[PDB]
Copies of this chain bind each other. A is one copy, B any other.
Amino acid sequence: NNTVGELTKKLASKLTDLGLRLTTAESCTGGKLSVALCAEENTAEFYDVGLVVFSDEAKMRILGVRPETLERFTAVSEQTVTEMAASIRDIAQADISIAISGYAGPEGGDDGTAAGTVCFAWNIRGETETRTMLFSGDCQDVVEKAVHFSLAELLAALS
User: Residues of A at under 8 Å CB distance from B?
Assistant: 30-35, 37-39, 43-44, 47-55, 57-58, 61-62, 91-93
Q: How far is the CA of A92 from the CA of B57 in the complex (A)?
A: 10
The interface residues of chain B lying within 8 Å CB-to-CB of A31 are 31-35, 38, 50, 52
The answer on a CB contact under 8 Å between A52 and B34 is yes
The interface residues of chain B lying within 8 Å CB-to-CB of A53 are 48-50
The answer on a CB contact under 8 Å between A38 and B34 is no
Q: How far is the CA of A61 from the CA of B94 in the complex (A)?
A: 13
Q: How far is the CA of A50 from the CA of B77 in the complex (A)?
A: 21
Out of B30, B38, B47, B51, which one reaches A38, CB within 8 Å?
B30
The interface residues of chain B lying within 8 Å CB-to-CB of A33 are 31
Supposing A43-B54, A44-B54, A54-B44 touch, asked if A49 and B34 sit within 8 A by C-beta, the answer is no
The interface residues of chain B lying within 8 Å CB-to-CB of A35 are 30-32, 35
Out of B39, B61, B91, B93, which one reaches A30, CB within 8 Å?
B39
Instruction: Across the interface, name the chain B residue whose C-beta is closest to A24.
Output: B52
The interface residues of chain B lying within 8 Å CB-to-CB of A50 are 31, 51-53
Other 19 A-B pairs with CB < 8 A, given A31-B31, A52-B52, A57-B93: A30-B34, A30-B35, A30-B39, A31-B32, A31-B35, A31-B38, A31-B52, A32-B35, A34-B52, A38-B54, A43-B54, A44-B55, A47-B54, A49-B52, A50-B51, A50-B52, A51-B52, A61-B93, A62-B92
